[PDB]
Amino acid sequence: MDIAVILVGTTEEVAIKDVHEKDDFHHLPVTPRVELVTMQESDPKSIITRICDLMSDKKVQGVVFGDDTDQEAIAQILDFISVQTLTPILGIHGGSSMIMADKEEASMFFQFGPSIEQQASVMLNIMEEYDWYIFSIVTTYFPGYQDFENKVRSTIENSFVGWELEEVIHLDMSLDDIDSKIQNQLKKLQSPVILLYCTKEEATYIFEVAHSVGLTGYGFTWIVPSLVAGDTDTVPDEFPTGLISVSYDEWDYDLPARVRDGIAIITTAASTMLSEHNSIPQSKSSCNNIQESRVYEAHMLKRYLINVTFEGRDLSFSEDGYQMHPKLVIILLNQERKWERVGKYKDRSLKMWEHLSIVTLEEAPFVIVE
Amino acid sequence: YEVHLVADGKFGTQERVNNSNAAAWNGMMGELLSGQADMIVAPLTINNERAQYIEFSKPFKYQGLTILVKKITGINDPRLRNPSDKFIYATVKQSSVDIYFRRQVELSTMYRHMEKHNYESAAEAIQAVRDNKLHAFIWDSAVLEFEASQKCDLVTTGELFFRSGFGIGMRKDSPWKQEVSLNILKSH
Amino acid sequence: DPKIVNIGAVLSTKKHEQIFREAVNQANFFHFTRKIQLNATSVTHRPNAIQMALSVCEDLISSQVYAILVSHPPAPTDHLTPTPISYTAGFYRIPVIGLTTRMSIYSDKSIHLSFLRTVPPYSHQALVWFEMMRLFNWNHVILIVSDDHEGRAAQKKLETLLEEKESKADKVLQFEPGTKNLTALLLEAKELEARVIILSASEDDATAVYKSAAMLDMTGAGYVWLVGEREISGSALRYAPDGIIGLQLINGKNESAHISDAVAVVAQAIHELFEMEQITDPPRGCVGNTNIWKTGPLFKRVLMSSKYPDGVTGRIEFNEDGDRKFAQYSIMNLQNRKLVQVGIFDGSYIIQNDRKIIWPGGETERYQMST
């Protein structure tokens, strides 16, 4: 097979990328042929240009993209490229890993990412783990609302337990306030556990407002989906400490390990498609001309390709194109500016890491041991 | 009129999938919203949870829950309050009584004792008391009193609690129900 | 001293490029050239997505474009060939404006966050259908949708429209791709009391729908048809039932008008933008910049709010999704197996043309009583 992978920024050529794949999966009857290129700097014009130019020198049937960047747009651009080449592309970190619009069905694209419902589920699991039964949701008109409410309504509703939803608040960041209408709503809520959903910046404003309201203070606790923490590299301390939020793993997969997983997915998919039809996946890569004939067959591969496994570990994707079995970490804001991992969560299940002692004895009905 | 019994033995209950609000309450009620039947004639208790979804005809009869024991001080029985592994009190899981137990917070503790040793159907539940497998049986009177007459080996006791009226279901949009209630009263 | 502000676009033909540059010069002439000036850079459509995205990163973004315009190509390839750019531009949050592309999938802010358009979608068409409802003074109807983001969004549109008012679910019907024969679902439809029918579908699908529907004689009087615009065109047109109510858009196949107006809006937006400070030029070239352009979202915010009601295409305002608002549709009737305008819809209020109404069946104009 013919494959290509790219790394952007860090100002470096790095041995570890060969080290990454360390000639991984050589055992597989089909061998990966890899061409590596890096670019110090990225552009939609630059990125668009380089991969196709690489199509001309490599004629690769798959691509993995990786970046040092915090940039949202890159992933989406790559989705467009998937639509354009009909050549699979995936990404293991940064912007490509960052969430994107619902992918075109015809398009083939993969990200090391996730969705909104799943995140809400993790928030619920986290709350359940600490047994925080009573909570409220502060949300904004930002996309995904009341689908967030809806997902929560089903998840909270199904369970036998009597947990309480106290308030749901919808406030438009647009029509910015002299009234401190956000202060006026937020001040009202008495609940100990708050789920917040908004744009990162909006989170800054809402938190300043909460600090004024006194909602950030002890015994109340806040829980957040992926978006607010974002890169996690930069953290305005406007966020209160003890803020609990979910984010992609880091110490679980090295940039090189993640690339190895990607190569493994592409070549495992190639192997499964081979096993099924005994047919070479290799296709003409050139974007400029019309898409190569027999590229349409690749379609079946994707339908087949959605779940790919290596190392007894699932890379399985989901219809959106996010890992169908993506991996995730429970993170908290450690004192000062630190983001420190706390729990790990994957697939269905999650795992996270005046006293006056009293003694008694069991009696008839008074004190009963069961 | 043309009548066909609903496929599901259950009258109806909300169920299934999580996303948005998905599917609809299984059973004859579901047929009513679906339009499989435009009007529902059956012994249906009338409650608010259902009531928002559909219009309800005026009731023409009353009835409540009670207990059958072979010949229990109250709906609140210290004997219930003093449960015993030795003295069973039996019900059907997924029977509406169970919904009363789950939905209500005040007695929520008492539900679990009932949950133990549940029976699948009405005949088996009456039989257990008749077979003397279970010392007590809890169900709404309308089904139970007729049986109480049928054997007399078994008896109903206490005061109907958690009772309710029975009425004919129609969509709020259908005006015929306006006559129905008007007729129901005239029949009363 | 002057400042040169670039703009970029992708259009069907060089003639339209000249129209673009001409319009840009018109914008320059009629607004202060002392403070600021506008400059145009552009490239032809590339056969594939990749050459074009590469064109944006290289040929356009190297000129530091503050925004991009895009139009559907002369020969449509698949659909949404302006998918990639919005993605590439989306990377730096450089605003994108379509003249063409009625596609609904751009309505979701998530996937395309830089995308604005001088048009609308199909989901919003339900407003017309909803507006249509005012006319029949019937609250009970039936909805038939394909299963996809399009149909489900449409369902959302009628229902969101219905929710403010008392909730109306007379009936709902969902179908799945590739089934040439759907008869049973309509058999289910007949059981339902409501006598009015409405549908949304793919080009191939509307044919199968009408074909199956005529079999059960749901095209007869006491039954009514309301439908989307795309559905009525093509092979489906051949098989359409009489008296149907249908929808048509205006100035959708014309790039030039939308060009002049879009650029006018862009000019107004830019001139409104520079009133604010802390502006930054967009990134120079695709190469070497992994970072977004901080101004871009602000530019989007003003551009969505940018008024300028007088325009060649009509009034200009943008909905929350960035989709165009207060758009105008032309109602259509099936009279004598030919398309006719019974009326035209503009703004929030429908307008009734003098033309004869077409209804289904042996009716010039046409709940149902279930004994």
XYZ file of N, CA, C and O in Angstrom, chain A residues 150-151 154, chain B residues 18-20:
24
model
N -32.165 17.555 25.799
C -32.851 16.337 25.399
C -32.084 15.065 25.769
O -32.658 14.121 26.326
N -30.783 15.053 25.480
C -29.941 13.898 25.779
C -29.916 13.663 27.281
O -30.019 12.526 27.748
N -33.279 12.260 28.525
C -33.351 10.802 28.409
C -32.443 10.074 29.414
O -32.878 9.142 30.107
N -33.963 6.918 23.956
C -33.500 8.084 24.712
C -33.490 9.426 23.968
O -33.914 10.442 24.519
N -32.980 9.429 22.739
C -32.807 10.665 21.968
C -34.108 11.433 21.728
O -35.142 10.831 21.414
N -34.039 12.759 21.858
C -35.218 13.626 21.841
C -36.237 13.078 22.826
O -35.913 12.797 23.977
